[PDB]
RNA sequence: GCGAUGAUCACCCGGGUGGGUACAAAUGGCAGUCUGACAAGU
């Protein structure tokens, strides 16, 4: 019903940080993506 | 163990782990349709079989990896699949819709058709229609109203095939997902120019285009255009 | 009177339309949006059900070819009593064929009628009492494959999966027949052990 | 004083228990092509073979035939109604008469 | 001839290993993603987060984007290192395949010289050596 | 699947164990496969069986 | 000969048969349906030429199935006797294949014809 | 109200991991389907 209080949009939004924090671990780290990207082009080409 | 997780679009998952893959739940456990890998995982615990979805073999799967905002293919929905060469992609679409949903697979060529039939026996919710899509009136009996129309037909006049099928079977505000190959339509111009024309031709057919997505690296000179069928 | 011919996997349905000229109304979409409106506007005049799959396959091919079947003819013959009634058909081919039957029906096939069929098919399970949506799928599934078997020219005498089983079964029978023969030779040989050397064939033994 | 008859009988008895199962499984497959769901209805293989000997063609469905197959085993499981309703609507592709002849004879073999 | 057979069999194994490996791996999409908005105003205040209703970090993930509402024991570095090996392993399969392809082709080129016919050696300025056969029909 | 195979494979279809051992160890490959039991091959004698 | 499709016109056949002759002299040509079938399996075929007058046509009809599977261009030419002479042999040839070689001296001509065959499909 | 016609002699938190024997299935792996223009006669 969109009746959120000032407390409401804090707890739910904490969950956003919690889950988004979790998915980053699966997302993998950026420096690896630099190497993984190069390998991807060679295999694809 | 592999950690199966939910995905944005219902009926689709990702089998994260040491190897991460786009995955769908198997409707008929104990067999693979086209030799794809299967993964079974216990959930409270009962092991539930899953099938891998290869983006390079299915263009719809290439749409998922591209990050399509909206897919009208969802559990418990009626889907009309045009250009169903075999069960390579229809099986996965059948998995997404689930037992409650139904898939209307339309194909013209006989040799892929016999392959399609042999799969349809294993999947009760797939209704294979061996007929030419350019004349949808021929198979009007077997198809009721459908929530979405997916078309992988690689024909120059494809936008007309979408028109006739959408007009007869697609519901108002229904789904339209089109896979376009530029090289078939016009190889002299760049692919972007071809895609702009295809969007416009759909617009002339009371289909509002919502989003467009190009399918690299999975395919070259291909894009998926999603639109909504606005009858009003 | 206005009539609508609806073709289904379960059978033929004749819907009597209240207004004679519904198909010239520009507000069909709004008029037919809900099942209640559909039921009020359209009433089942006659319904011919497919008794068996073989009949259904024959009926399906007539519609695909655009030919009037005997069951459809008889179903139209019942409603003949209404003088000067319009009949609405989805296909122009089927409309033309019905016209040649000489029937007292003004047969009309127009793009405007397309919307009428859209609403009818959308609420068809509710329009047709006694058969659920699940059943309607089940007849459609079986009918589709049988049509598919016909179009693909499938013949029961040209399936190779039987060959692969028969050869495998034939090898299995050779193995099993051999073990039983040896058991009989050694079990009966106790009574008369000299037979095996003389006669070697298991069946003759 | 002979006890080797016992040794022959046991060596044969378990062999029959293997062959009866192996052949019965094949009978399920072959008739599975013509009527795949029925193999699910009657899991007990010996009952399945006797039923298949009766219902050779799933097209043939009569009320008297329903009673006759209802006499086979009991209607407590309800399989008698399921097969008649399910034979009407099924996915099994019809196999040739010669193929059916093999199934019944091979099913007859499992009976012997 | 036996040398040619030996190399080709190795190349065929490598190709099949490459195909199985590639199916194992998952490649992130790199494709343009356009959205259609009717009004010029809806363009100017367009924002990816608003359209997808998801956090800005979560937007740039094309494979699996999730709206905020859905959002509402192996070390990561080791798992990172295990992905890259799986990627490098498939790459090495491709490199081995190309090398075996080149070795076979040079082998087949030599085998043609052994066969009957009239041929002339032609040498380019770069020094590449090739043979041109005369236009004589095989009897 | 058989129809899409070349005639060379059909010759040595049933003898993969001998074929791939020979191919990898640089030895001569089999020449009959499963066709050895056809009537026409039986009529042939000596090296004519291979032909 | 309805099954033979796509069938090249006279102007395109001369272009195809010209490349087949050049490939033969460079030993870049595989002759015969069985030997052409292999090149598809090894993935070394630029495109496949078939003869429409082959009788029965089915003996070469497996190649379209393999070619569409592997995404290799294929085209039919009206005469198998003419194909055999272009190949440079004393017998009629119902099928031939151009082997892939990116260092070949006739690479440009093969690709020029290959593009035309793609347009035909 | 005994007995030589035979006494005695893995792990972890009610729950889960570890090991063994037998059978069956797998479109799971090993695993990749030989060569390619001459030969026989006078």
From Swiss-Prot, chain A:
The places in or outside the cell where this protein is found are: Nucleus, Nucleolus
- Miscellaneous comment text of the record: Present with 3670 molecules/cell in log phase SD medium.
Protein family: Belongs to the RRT14 family.
Its biological purpose is as follows:
Involved in ribosome biogenesis, probably through modulation of rDNA transcription.
Q: What is this protein called?
A: Regulator of rDNA transcription protein 14
Included range, full protein: 104 to 148 of 206
From Swiss-Prot, chain B:
What PTM annotation applies here? Methylated by HMT1, forming asymmetric dimethylarginines (DMA) within a domain referred to as an RGG box, made up of repeated Gly-Gly dipeptides interspersed with Arg and aromatic residues.
Task: List residues of cross-link (Glycyl lysine isopeptide (Lys-Gly) (interchain with G-Cter in ubiquitin)).
Answer: 59
This protein's superkingdom? Eukaryota
Supply the gene name. Answer: NOP1
- Compartments reported by the entry: Nucleus, Nucleolus
An example GO BP is: maturation of SSU-rRNA
Q: Where is this region: S-adenosyl-L-methionine binding?
A: 88-89, 107-108, 132-133, 152-155
Q: Which family does it belong to?
A: Belongs to the methyltransferase superfamily. Fibrillarin family.
Methyltransferase as a keyword? yes
Task: For the region Helical, give the residue spans.
Answer: 190-222
Its recorded reaction(s) are: L-glutaminyl-[histone H2A] + S-adenosyl-L-methionine = N(5)-methyl-L-glutaminyl-[histone H2A] + S-adenosyl-L-homocysteine + H(+); a ribonucleotide in rRNA + S-adenosyl-L-methionine = a 2'-O-methylribonucleotide in rRNA + S-adenosyl-L-homocysteine + H(+)
The species this protein belongs to is Saccharomyces cerevisiae (strain ATCC 204508 / S288c) (Baker's yeast)
Membrane-crossing segments per the record: none
Question: What does this protein do, in the record's words?
Answer: S-adenosyl-L-methionine-dependent methyltransferase that has the ability to methylate both RNAs and proteins. Involved in pre-rRNA processing by catalyzing the site-specific 2'-hydroxyl methylation of ribose moieties in pre-ribosomal RNA. Site specificity is provided by a guide RNA that base pairs with the substrate. Methylation occurs at a characteristic distance from the sequence involved in base pairing with the guide RNA. Involved in the biogenesis of the 18S rRNA.
Q: What is this protein called?
A: rRNA 2'-O-methyltransferase fibrillarin
Curated annotation (Swiss-Prot), chain D:
Localization terms from the record: Nucleus, Nucleolus
The family line of this record is: Belongs to the NOP5/NOP56 family.
Q: What else is known?
A: Present with 13500 molecules/cell in log phase SD medium.
What is this protein's function? Required for 60S ribosomal subunit synthesis.
> How does this protein assemble?
Interacts with NOP1 and NOP58. Component of the ribosomal small subunit (SSU) processome composed of at least 40 protein subunits and snoRNA U3.
Q: What is this protein called?
A: Nucleolar protein 56
Q: Which organism is it from?
A: Saccharomyces cerevisiae (strain ATCC 204508 / S288c) (Baker's yeast)
Q: Which gene encodes it?
A: NOP56
Q: Which span of the entire protein is present here?
A: 169 to 280 of 504
Curated annotation (Swiss-Prot), chain F:
Q: What is this protein's record name? A: Nucleolar protein 58
Protein family membership: Belongs to the NOP5/NOP56 family.
Q: What else is known?
A: Present with 34700 molecules/cell in log phase SD medium.
- Functional description taken from the UniProt entry: Required for pre-18S rRNA processing. May bind microtubules.
Q: Which residues of the full protein are shown?
A: 308 to 358 of 511
Please describe the quaternary structure of this protein.
Answer: Interacts with SIK1/NOP56 and NOP1. Interacts with the trimethylguanosine synthase TGS1. Component of the ribosomal small subunit (SSU) processome composed of at least 40 protein subunits and snoRNA U3.
Q: Which domain of life is it from?
A: Eukaryota
Location within or outside the cell? Nucleus, Nucleolus
Q: What is the lineage of its organism?
A: Eukaryota, Fungi, Dikarya, Ascomycota, Saccharomycotina
